[PDB]
Amino acid sequence: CAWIPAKPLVQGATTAQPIPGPVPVANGSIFQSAQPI
Amino acid sequence: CAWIPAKPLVQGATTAQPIPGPVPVANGSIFQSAQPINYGYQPLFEDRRPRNIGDTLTIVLQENVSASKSSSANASRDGKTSFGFDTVPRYLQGLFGNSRADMEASGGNSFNGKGGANASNTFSGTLTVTVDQVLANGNLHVVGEKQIAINQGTEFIRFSGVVNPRTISGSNSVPSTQVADARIEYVGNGYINEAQNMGWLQRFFLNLSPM
Amino acid sequence: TEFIRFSGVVNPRTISGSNSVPSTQVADARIEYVGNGYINEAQNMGWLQRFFLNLSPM
Amino acid sequence: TEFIRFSGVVNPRTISGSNSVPSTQVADARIEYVGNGYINEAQNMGWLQRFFLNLSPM
Amino acid sequence: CAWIPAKPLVQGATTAQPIPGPVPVANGSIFQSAQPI
């Protein structure tokens, strides 16, 4: 009865790969902000 | 049964060979930096919070729920009646003589019902989760899993929810009661878990037996 | 279900600063405290007992 | 499942600074506290007992 | 008897997706207020 396939409570992926960030613009500044929310 | 090939919990290689470093450029400087990984604007006095997808956040699981209810009702009613003309006078022996009115009756009714229920649950632990979605209002959807294999089994602690960034403390930690859609799971496998499942026949009699 | 009913005549000068008046300052005080359900039905004498209470010689 | 229902008429000047008023300051107070499920079904008299409570002589 | 389908007490959805906010107007101000209630 413990061998019956079951759906977990937290479905899906339990990890997220950090997304690489945008390439800085060529404006002469060190501060570069990604697409602001 | 212990000779059956099995896949470990931490699959893959458990070691990494340091990669040799780039050959320094011939610019007349001692400081030489390998291909730099840029991470974007990082604040200096703002607390270390998860901001993007992939950032990690510590959840202090502390759940303590205890609900209860109880009720009762009762009723009772007792009655006795009696009349005895032990010595009937002669002028009244036609109305009360020969026990024509002598009576004795009794009655009783009782009822006592009661009921109640109670539920409780507790959880205490610490789990690091990862932000896998940033919502329109800035709230972070977080998911996480910890797997521990001790001796003869495997335990999985999974967590999921929505965390408001302003609830995260200075140590990048938030109690589990501040997560909106908290999904907390603590399961295991192996014969230790198989020993806590009711037998199919017992689990059928629990549902289909009359009493 | 329990019903608490009240009726009467209140003189305004007896009402305190908290808009309250004791029930002994109401002229035609009609106070009722009744209930229904089997709890109330258990406190009514049986018809035969209630008849013997009135018609039995002693 | 338990249901707690309330109804009545509240005078605004009785409401405290914390937006709260005791239930004894509500004019037509209708307070109900009921439940369902087998816990409630266990507190109802059996139909035959509820009939003998009303129709038995004593 | 526990397998009988039942309607929960809190029916409906138990979550709300934050709605994306209006696009700021081009008036030269940083303060932008959505349709005020």
UniProtKB/Swiss-Prot annotation, chains A, E:
A lipid is attached at residue 1 (N-palmitoyl cysteine). It is found in: Cell outer membrane; Bacterial flagellum basal body. A lipid is attached at residue 1 (S-diacylglycerol cysteine). It comes from the Bacteria. Transmembrane segments: none annotated. The basal body constitutes a major portion of the flagellar organelle and consists of four rings (L,P,S, and M) mounted on a central rod. Assembles around the rod to form the L-ring and probably protects the motor/basal body from shearing forces during rotation. Belongs to the FlgH family. This is Flagellar L-ring protein. It comes from Salmonella typhimurium (strain LT2 / SGSC1412 / ATCC 700720). The gene is flgH. The chain holds residues 22 to 58 of 232 of the full protein.
